[PDB]
C-alpha cells in the first residue's frame, strides 16, 4: 500500500492507488509512515476486524455497485467534496464513496437496494456524516431530523446523526463514521436515508482465504518466492529455530532468543 493504510486504500483516499483488474494477494504490507487513511476525521467501526478479513484473498474484484451517473436522480452527487480530502490542491473525496447532498433545496427519502449476483461475498462500505452545526445539517441535507437505515438478511442498524462542534481535525469540526459489511451471495442490502448518508459507489467482490497477516515494514518488495516471511526479510531454511523476528507469516521455524545453537556431529578435536 505504500503511502496509504488499509482504510485509505479500501475507501479510495485521493493519495492512494486503485486496483482495476481482478487481483489477489498472500499478505498485506504497510509502511511505518503510511499515514493517509480517513482524510475526513471520524471512527472506522471494527477497523481491526476488517484488516484481518482482508489480509489474504483468493479473488478480489471492484465493481460500481451504485453507478454514479444513474443511481441518484433526485440527489446531488457532485458537490460532496471537501478540503479535508484534497486532490491536486482541489477539494475531493473518497473514490469508493459518494457524499450525497441535497439537490437544490430538496432531499427526498432515499431508498436503494443491491442484490449480490456475483457468486461470492461482496464487501460494502458506507459512511455516516455528523455535521458540526444545525446550519451545516440544513445546508447539506435540508432536513433537520434525519436517520440512516442499512439492512441485510443479517445486518440491521439505524443511524442517527449527532450534531455538535468537535475540535478541528484537518480543518473539520464535524465527524464521519465509516462502516462495512459482507453481503453473502444471493442476499440484498438496503440503504434508506433522509440525510447524512455517504453512499457506496464501488463495492468489492472477494473470496477470503485462511487468514494471513499484515506486515508493517520499510523492507522493499522483490520478485522472490519464500515460504516464511518476516518484517526484516524472508527466511529460507529447514532448521527448526530462528532468531530474526518473532512476528512471521507462513510455515516458519520457532522464534528463539538464542544467539548460537551449534550441534556437535564430529568428535572432540585433539590434534597434536
Amino acid at each position: 500500500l505504500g503511502k496509504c493504510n488499509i482504510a485509505g486504500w479500501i475507501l479510495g483516499n485521493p493519495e492512494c492507488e486503485s486496483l482495476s483488474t481482478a487481483s489477489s494477494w498472500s499478505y498485506i504490507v504497510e509502511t511505518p509512515s503510511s499515514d493517509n487513511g480517513t482524510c475526513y476525521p471520524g471512527d472506522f467501526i471494527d477497523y481491526e476486524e476488517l484488516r484481518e478479513q482482508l489480509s489474504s484473498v483468493s479473488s478480489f474484484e471492484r465493481f460500481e455497485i451504485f453507478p454514479k451517473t444513474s443511481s441518484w436522480p433526485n440527489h446531488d452527487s457532485n458537490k460532496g467534496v471537501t478540503a479535508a480530502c484534497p486532490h491536486a490542491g482541489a477539494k475531493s473525496f473518497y473514490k469508493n464513496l459518494i457524499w450525497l447532498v441535497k439537490k437544490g433545496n430538496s432531499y427526498p427519502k432515499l431508498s436503494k437496494s443491491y442484490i449480490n449476483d456475483k457468486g461470492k461475498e461482496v464487501l460494502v462500505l458506507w459512511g455516516i456524516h455528523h455535521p458540526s452545526t444545525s446550519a451545516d445539517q440544513q445546508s447539506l441535507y435540508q432536513n433537520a431530523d434525519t436517520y440512516v437505515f442499512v439492512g441485510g438478511s443479517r445486518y440491521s442498524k439505524k443511524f442517527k446523526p449527532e450534531i455538535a462542534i468537535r475540535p478541528k481535525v484537518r480543518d473539520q469540526e464535524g465527524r464521519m463514521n465509516y462502516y462495512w459489511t459482507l453481503v453473502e451471495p444471493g442476499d440484498k442490502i438496503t440503504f434508506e436515508a433522509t440525510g447524512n448518508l455517504v453512499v457506496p459507489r464501488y463495492a468489492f467482490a472477494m473470496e477470503r482465504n485462511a487468514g494471513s497477516g499484515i506486515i508493517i515494514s520499510d523492507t522493499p518488495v522483490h520478485d522472490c518466492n519464500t515460504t516464511c516471511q518476516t518484517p526484516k526479510g524472508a527466511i529460507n531454511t529447514s532448521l527448526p529455530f530462528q532468531n530474526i523476528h518473532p512476528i512471521t507469516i507462513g510455515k516458519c521455524p520457532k522464534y528463539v532468543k538464542s544467539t548460537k545453537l551449534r550441534l556437535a556431529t564430529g568428535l572432540r578435536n585433539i590434534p597434536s
Binding site: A210, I214, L239, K254, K257, L263, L267, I270, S272
Partner: protein
C-alpha cells in the same frame, strides 16, 4: 570422557587419518600408514545423520500468522496476546538451549564409546599374541603382514594360526 578412550588412554587424534572418524595405524615390514575402519565410521555417520534429522524433521509447523492488531481500548487482550508469544518464546528458547547442551554431550560420549568398542574388539581378537603398549597400540609377538593386518580390521584374525609362534616369542622376550 564417559568411556575413557577419547582424551583418555588414547590421548590425541590423528590429522594423518583423513578418510574416516575411527581407524588404524599399522606398521609392518611392508611399510606403514593410516587407514579408517569403514564399518564403524559408516555406522556412526548413519547414526549421527539420523540424530540430526530427528532433531530437525520432528518440527513440522503449519501456515500461521503470529501478528495481531488491537486498538487503544483493547489493552488487556493485547497483553494476553503478548503473554502467549512470550510464553512460547520462553518455552522454545529454554528447551532448544538444553536440547543442544544435553545432546552435544551425548554425541561426544557416543564417539568415545565407538572408539572403546573398536579398541576392545581388537584386544579380544589378539589376546596374548600381542602386547598392550598403551595409547591404543598393539605390538605383535608374531609377524603380521598386510593380509594379517586386514584380518584384524575385518574381524577375522586367526588366533590359533599364530598362537604357537607368538607363545615362543613371548616367552623368549619375557625371559
Amino acid at each position: 570422557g564417559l568411556f575413557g578412550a577419547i582424551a583418555g588412554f588414547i590421548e590425541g587424534g590423528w590429522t594423518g587419518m583423513v578418510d574416516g572418524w575411527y581407524g588404524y595405524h599399522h606398521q609392518n615390514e611392508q611399510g606403514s600408514g593410516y587407514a579408517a575402519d569403514l564399518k564403524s565410521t559408516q555406522n556412526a555417520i548413519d547414526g549421527i545423520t539420523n540424530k540430526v534429522n530427528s532433531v530437525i524433521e520432528k518440527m513440522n509447523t503449519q501456515f500461521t500468522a503470529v501478528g495481531k492488531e488491537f486498538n487503544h481500548l483493547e489493552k488487556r487482550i493485547e497483553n494476553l496476546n503478548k503473554k502467549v508469544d512470550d510464553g512460547f518464546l520462553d518455552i522454545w528458547t529454554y528447551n532448544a538451549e538444553l536440547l543442544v547442551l544435553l545432546e552435544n554431550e551425548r554425541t561426544l560420549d557416543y564417539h568415545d564409546s565407538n572408539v572403546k568398542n573398536l579398541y576392545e574388539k581388537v584386544r579380544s581378537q589378539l589376546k596374548n599374541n600381542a602386547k598392550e603398549i598403551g595409547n591404543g597400540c598393539f605390538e605383535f609377538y608374531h609377524k603380521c603382514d598386510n593380509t594379517c593386518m586386514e584380518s584384524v580390521k575385518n574381524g577375522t584374525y586367526d588366533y590359533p594360526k599364530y598362537s604357537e609362534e607368538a607363545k615362543l616369542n613371548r616367552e623368549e622376550i619375557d625371559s
